[PDB]
Amino acid sequence: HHWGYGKHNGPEHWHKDFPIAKGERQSPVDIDTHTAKYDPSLKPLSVSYDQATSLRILNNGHAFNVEFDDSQDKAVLKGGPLDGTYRLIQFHFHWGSLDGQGSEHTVDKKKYAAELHLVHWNTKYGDFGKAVQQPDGLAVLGIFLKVGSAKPGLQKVVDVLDSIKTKGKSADFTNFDPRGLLPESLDYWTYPGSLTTPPLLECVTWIVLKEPISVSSEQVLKFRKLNFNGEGEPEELMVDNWRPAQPLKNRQIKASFK
Ligand SMILES: NS(=O)(=O)c1ccc(C(=O)N2CCN(c3cc4c(cc3F)c(=O)c(C(=O)O)cn4C3CC3)CC2)cc1
Numbered sequence: 734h735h736w737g738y739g740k741h742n743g744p745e746h747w748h749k750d751f752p753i754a755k756g757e758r759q760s761p762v763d764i765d766t767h768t769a770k771y772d773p774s775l776k777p778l779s780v781s782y783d784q785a786t787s788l789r790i791l792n793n794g795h796a797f798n799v800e801f802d803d804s805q806d807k808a809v810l811k812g813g814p815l816d817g818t819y820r821l822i823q824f825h826f827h828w829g830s831l832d833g834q835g836s837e838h839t840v841d842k843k844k845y846a847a848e849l850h851l852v853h854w855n856t857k858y859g860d861f862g863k864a865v866q867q868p869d870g871l872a873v874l875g876i877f878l879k880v881g882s883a884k885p886g887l888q889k890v891v892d893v894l895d896s897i898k899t900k901g902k903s904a905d906f907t908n909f910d911p912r913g914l915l916p917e918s919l920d921y922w923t924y925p926g927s928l929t930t931p932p933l934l935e936c937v938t939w940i941v942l943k944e945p946i947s948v949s950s951e952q953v954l955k956f957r958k959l960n961f962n963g964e965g966e967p968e969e970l971m972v973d974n975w976r977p978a979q980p981l982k983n984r985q986i987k988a989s990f991k
Protein backbone atom coordinates (compact mmCIF):
# COMPACT_ATOMS: atom_id res chain seq x y z
CA HIS A 734 0.00 0.00 0.00
CA HIS A 735 2.51 2.60 -1.36
CA TRP A 736 1.78 6.34 -1.67
CA GLY A 737 0.29 7.60 -4.90
CA TYR A 738 -2.50 9.82 -6.23
CA GLY A 739 -5.53 7.48 -5.82
CA LYS A 740 -8.57 7.69 -3.44
CA HIS A 741 -6.86 5.21 -1.12
CA ASN A 742 -3.21 6.43 -1.22
CA GLY A 743 -3.42 10.07 -2.40
CA PRO A 744 -2.32 13.37 -0.79
CA GLU A 745 -4.93 13.29 2.04
CA HIS A 746 -3.29 9.96 3.26
CA TRP A 747 0.43 10.94 3.03
CA HIS A 748 0.63 12.39 6.58
CA LYS A 749 0.27 8.87 8.09
CA ASP A 750 3.65 7.68 6.71
CA PHE A 751 5.13 11.22 6.38
CA PRO A 752 3.90 13.40 9.28
CA ILE A 753 5.89 16.45 7.89
CA ALA A 754 2.93 16.58 5.42
CA LYS A 755 1.29 18.88 8.05
CA GLY A 756 4.56 20.84 8.61
CA GLU A 757 5.42 24.58 8.63
CA ARG A 758 6.85 24.93 5.05
CA GLN A 759 4.93 22.51 2.80
CA SER A 760 4.50 22.86 -0.95
CA PRO A 761 2.83 23.64 -3.21
CA VAL A 762 0.94 26.84 -2.25
CA ASP A 763 -1.49 29.26 -3.79
CA ILE A 764 0.34 32.39 -4.98
CA ASP A 765 -1.87 35.34 -4.04
CA THR A 766 -0.58 37.91 -6.57
CA HIS A 767 -2.02 40.90 -4.63
CA THR A 768 -0.23 39.76 -1.36
CA ALA A 769 3.20 38.79 -2.84
CA LYS A 770 5.59 41.69 -2.29
CA TYR A 771 8.19 42.90 -4.81
CA ASP A 772 11.63 42.40 -3.20
CA PRO A 773 14.18 44.83 -4.74
CA SER A 774 16.98 42.86 -2.96
CA LEU A 775 16.40 39.72 -5.12
CA LYS A 776 19.54 39.38 -7.35
CA PRO A 777 19.20 38.54 -11.02
CA LEU A 778 18.21 34.88 -11.80
CA SER A 779 20.87 32.99 -13.80
CA VAL A 780 19.73 29.85 -15.71
CA SER A 781 22.93 28.42 -17.35
CA TYR A 782 21.84 25.34 -19.37
CA ASP A 783 24.21 25.64 -22.46
CA GLN A 784 26.35 22.64 -21.27
CA ALA A 785 23.39 20.51 -20.03
CA THR A 786 23.99 16.75 -20.56
CA SER A 787 20.62 14.80 -20.58
CA LEU A 788 21.08 11.02 -20.20
CA ARG A 789 17.82 9.16 -19.75
CA ILE A 790 14.08 9.33 -19.34
CA LEU A 791 12.41 7.15 -16.64
CA ASN A 792 8.75 6.35 -15.82
CA ASN A 793 9.01 6.11 -11.99
CA GLY A 794 5.33 5.22 -11.43
CA HIS A 795 4.45 8.82 -10.33
CA ALA A 796 5.74 10.93 -13.26
CA PHE A 797 8.58 10.73 -15.77
CA ASN A 798 12.04 12.13 -15.04
CA VAL A 799 14.44 13.48 -17.64
CA GLU A 800 17.77 12.87 -15.93
CA PHE A 801 21.00 14.93 -16.37
CA ASP A 802 24.70 14.32 -15.70
CA ASP A 803 25.19 16.26 -12.40
CA SER A 804 28.73 14.81 -11.75
CA GLN A 805 30.15 18.34 -12.54
CA ASP A 806 28.80 21.97 -12.87
CA LYS A 807 27.26 21.74 -16.39
CA ALA A 808 23.68 23.01 -16.11
CA VAL A 809 23.31 25.32 -13.08
CA LEU A 810 20.89 27.72 -11.47
CA LYS A 811 22.29 30.71 -9.56
CA GLY A 812 21.18 34.17 -8.40
CA GLY A 813 17.63 35.17 -7.65
CA PRO A 814 17.06 34.27 -3.97
CA LEU A 815 19.87 31.65 -4.04
CA ASP A 816 23.29 31.69 -2.46
CA GLY A 817 25.88 29.61 -4.38
CA THR A 818 25.47 27.11 -7.18
CA TYR A 819 22.66 24.62 -7.78
CA ARG A 820 23.18 21.74 -10.26
CA LEU A 821 20.37 20.49 -12.50
CA ILE A 822 19.67 16.80 -11.72
CA GLN A 823 16.30 16.16 -13.44
CA PHE A 824 13.08 17.65 -14.64
CA HIS A 825 9.55 16.23 -14.51
CA PHE A 826 5.96 17.39 -14.81
CA HIS A 827 2.68 17.19 -12.94
CA TRP A 828 -0.50 17.20 -15.00
CA GLY A 829 -4.24 16.72 -15.01
CA SER A 830 -6.89 14.49 -16.51
CA LEU A 831 -8.38 17.67 -18.11
CA ASP A 832 -6.93 21.07 -19.04
CA GLY A 833 -8.57 22.84 -16.02
CA GLN A 834 -6.29 21.11 -13.46
CA GLY A 835 -2.80 19.62 -13.18
CA SER A 836 -0.53 22.32 -11.71
CA GLU A 837 0.58 22.07 -8.11
CA HIS A 838 1.11 25.77 -7.48
CA THR A 839 -1.92 27.95 -8.25
CA VAL A 840 -2.09 31.66 -9.06
CA ASP A 841 -5.01 33.47 -7.37
CA LYS A 842 -6.58 29.93 -7.11
CA LYS A 843 -6.07 29.40 -10.90
CA LYS A 844 -4.96 25.87 -11.80
CA TYR A 845 -2.87 25.39 -14.96
CA ALA A 846 -3.01 22.26 -17.14
CA ALA A 847 0.44 21.16 -15.92
CA GLU A 848 3.60 22.31 -14.14
CA LEU A 849 7.28 21.59 -15.04
CA HIS A 850 9.77 21.20 -12.19
CA LEU A 851 13.48 21.63 -12.98
CA VAL A 852 15.18 20.21 -9.88
CA HIS A 853 18.60 21.46 -8.74
CA TRP A 854 20.76 20.74 -5.69
CA ASN A 855 23.16 22.95 -3.74
CA THR A 856 26.73 21.88 -4.58
CA LYS A 857 27.96 22.97 -1.12
CA TYR A 858 26.38 19.65 0.20
CA GLY A 859 28.31 17.48 -2.29
CA ASP A 860 25.51 15.08 -3.33
CA PHE A 861 21.71 15.22 -3.77
CA GLY A 862 21.03 12.83 -0.86
CA LYS A 863 22.90 15.18 1.56
CA ALA A 864 21.29 18.27 0.02
CA VAL A 865 17.72 17.03 0.69
CA GLN A 866 18.59 16.95 4.46
CA GLN A 867 19.22 20.75 4.44
CA PRO A 868 16.78 23.70 4.50
CA ASP A 869 18.58 25.29 1.50
CA GLY A 870 19.44 21.99 -0.22
CA LEU A 871 17.30 22.19 -3.40
CA ALA A 872 16.05 24.84 -5.78
CA VAL A 873 13.12 23.89 -7.96
CA LEU A 874 12.27 26.07 -10.93
CA GLY A 875 8.57 25.73 -11.56
CA ILE A 876 6.95 26.62 -14.92
CA PHE A 877 3.23 26.52 -15.66
CA LEU A 878 1.86 24.91 -18.85
CA LYS A 879 -1.29 26.13 -20.55
CA VAL A 880 -2.94 24.50 -23.55
CA GLY A 881 -2.75 26.49 -26.79
CA SER A 882 0.06 26.49 -29.39
CA ALA A 883 2.52 23.57 -29.40
CA LYS A 884 5.86 23.96 -27.61
CA PRO A 885 8.44 22.84 -30.20
CA GLY A 886 11.10 22.21 -27.53
CA LEU A 887 8.75 19.72 -25.80
CA GLN A 888 8.08 17.46 -28.81
CA LYS A 889 11.24 15.25 -28.37
CA VAL A 890 9.90 14.45 -24.82
CA VAL A 891 6.33 13.76 -26.12
CA ASP A 892 7.66 11.39 -28.84
CA VAL A 893 9.63 9.13 -26.45
CA LEU A 894 6.71 8.61 -23.98
CA ASP A 895 5.38 5.55 -25.97
CA SER A 896 8.69 3.82 -25.13
CA ILE A 897 8.32 4.38 -21.31
CA LYS A 898 4.56 3.79 -20.98
CA THR A 899 4.74 1.78 -17.71
CA LYS A 900 6.43 2.08 -14.30
CA GLY A 901 10.14 1.17 -14.32
CA LYS A 902 10.66 1.69 -18.08
CA SER A 903 13.49 3.96 -19.18
CA ALA A 904 14.96 5.09 -22.51
CA ASP A 905 18.21 6.74 -23.63
CA PHE A 906 17.49 10.50 -23.78
CA THR A 907 20.72 12.22 -24.78
CA ASN A 908 21.27 15.71 -26.26
CA PHE A 909 17.98 17.21 -24.99
CA ASP A 910 18.21 20.96 -24.44
CA PRO A 911 16.04 22.17 -21.53
CA ARG A 912 16.40 25.82 -22.70
CA GLY A 913 13.58 24.91 -25.19
CA LEU A 914 11.16 24.56 -22.23
CA LEU A 915 11.62 28.12 -20.80
CA PRO A 916 9.24 31.06 -21.34
CA GLU A 917 10.57 34.45 -22.64
CA SER A 918 10.46 36.14 -19.19
CA LEU A 919 12.26 34.91 -16.05
CA ASP A 920 10.00 37.05 -13.75
CA TYR A 921 9.27 34.85 -10.71
CA TRP A 922 7.81 34.36 -7.27
CA THR A 923 9.89 32.67 -4.53
CA TYR A 924 9.22 31.14 -1.11
CA PRO A 925 10.68 28.45 1.17
CA GLY A 926 8.95 25.10 0.85
CA SER A 927 9.20 21.38 0.41
CA LEU A 928 9.23 18.44 -1.99
CA THR A 929 5.65 18.03 -3.23
CA THR A 930 5.86 14.21 -3.09
CA PRO A 931 6.79 11.90 -0.16
CA PRO A 932 8.94 12.19 1.72
CA LEU A 933 7.86 15.88 1.61
CA LEU A 934 11.24 17.11 2.99
CA GLU A 935 11.37 20.84 3.79
CA CYS A 936 14.52 21.43 1.71
CA VAL A 937 13.33 23.47 -1.32
CA THR A 938 13.72 27.10 -2.37
CA TRP A 939 10.79 27.41 -4.82
CA ILE A 940 11.20 29.71 -7.81
CA VAL A 941 7.92 29.83 -9.80
CA LEU A 942 7.96 31.67 -13.12
CA LYS A 943 5.05 34.08 -13.74
CA GLU A 944 4.94 33.44 -17.53
CA PRO A 945 3.50 30.06 -18.51
CA ILE A 946 4.59 28.13 -21.57
CA SER A 947 2.03 27.02 -24.15
CA VAL A 948 1.75 23.37 -25.17
CA SER A 949 -0.73 21.82 -27.60
CA SER A 950 -3.76 19.66 -26.73
CA GLU A 951 -2.01 16.84 -28.64
CA GLN A 952 1.14 17.22 -26.51
CA VAL A 953 -0.68 17.03 -23.13
CA LEU A 954 -2.88 14.14 -24.46
CA LYS A 955 0.37 12.11 -24.88
CA PHE A 956 1.25 12.79 -21.21
CA ARG A 957 -2.13 11.37 -20.25
CA LYS A 958 -1.51 8.05 -22.15
CA LEU A 959 1.27 7.17 -19.71
CA ASN A 960 0.63 4.57 -17.01
CA PHE A 961 1.16 4.57 -13.21
CA ASN A 962 1.10 0.77 -13.36
CA GLY A 963 3.84 -1.61 -14.43
CA GLU A 964 3.83 -3.67 -17.64
CA GLY A 965 1.13 -6.38 -17.77
CA GLU A 966 -0.80 -4.78 -14.79
CA PRO A 967 -4.32 -3.33 -15.09
CA GLU A 968 -4.07 0.03 -16.86
CA GLU A 969 -4.22 3.10 -14.62
CA LEU A 970 -3.64 6.25 -16.68
CA MET A 971 -0.94 8.58 -15.28
CA VAL A 972 -3.14 11.67 -14.75
CA ASP A 973 -3.77 14.02 -11.79
CA ASN A 974 -0.31 13.39 -10.29
CA TRP A 975 -0.47 16.76 -8.48
CA ARG A 976 -0.58 17.66 -4.79
CA PRO A 977 -3.07 20.43 -3.96
CA ALA A 978 -2.09 23.76 -2.40
CA GLN A 979 -0.99 23.59 1.27
CA PRO A 980 -1.35 26.22 4.01
CA LEU A 981 1.11 29.11 3.67
CA LYS A 982 1.49 29.47 7.47
CA ASN A 983 4.31 31.83 8.51
CA ARG A 984 5.70 32.49 5.01
CA GLN A 985 5.94 35.43 2.59
CA ILE A 986 5.93 34.93 -1.17
CA LYS A 987 8.34 37.44 -2.75
CA ALA A 988 8.10 38.76 -6.33
CA SER A 989 11.13 39.51 -8.53
CA PHE A 990 9.07 42.10 -10.48
CA LYS A 991 6.84 45.22 -9.96
N1 LIG B 1 7.92 17.67 -7.17
S1 LIG B 1 9.31 18.14 -6.57
O1 LIG B 1 9.11 18.69 -5.26
O2 LIG B 1 9.99 18.93 -7.53
C1 LIG B 1 10.33 16.69 -6.34
C2 LIG B 1 9.84 15.54 -5.72
C3 LIG B 1 10.66 14.43 -5.58
C4 LIG B 1 11.98 14.45 -6.02
C5 LIG B 1 12.88 13.23 -6.01
O3 LIG B 1 13.48 12.91 -7.01
N2 LIG B 1 13.05 12.56 -4.86
C6 LIG B 1 12.69 13.04 -3.53
C7 LIG B 1 13.88 12.91 -2.63
N3 LIG B 1 14.32 11.51 -2.54
C8 LIG B 1 15.29 11.29 -1.47
C9 LIG B 1 16.57 10.80 -1.69
C10 LIG B 1 17.44 10.55 -0.63
C11 LIG B 1 17.08 10.87 0.69
C12 LIG B 1 15.81 11.40 0.91
C13 LIG B 1 14.95 11.58 -0.15
F1 LIG B 1 13.72 12.08 0.09
C14 LIG B 1 18.03 10.70 1.82
O4 LIG B 1 17.80 11.14 2.96
C15 LIG B 1 19.29 10.11 1.46
C16 LIG B 1 20.35 9.86 2.48
O5 LIG B 1 21.58 10.12 2.14
O6 LIG B 1 20.07 9.46 3.58
C17 LIG B 1 19.55 9.80 0.16
N4 LIG B 1 18.70 10.04 -0.87
C18 LIG B 1 19.16 9.88 -2.25
C19 LIG B 1 20.32 8.99 -2.52
C20 LIG B 1 18.94 8.57 -2.93
C21 LIG B 1 14.77 11.12 -3.87
C22 LIG B 1 13.67 11.23 -4.88
C23 LIG B 1 12.47 15.63 -6.59
C24 LIG B 1 11.65 16.74 -6.76
Ligand SMILES: [Zn+2]
Binds near residue numbers: 825929
Ligand atom coordinates in the same frame (compact mmCIF):
# COMPACT_ATOMS: atom_id res chain seq x y z
ZN1 LIG C 1 7.48 18.04 -9.01
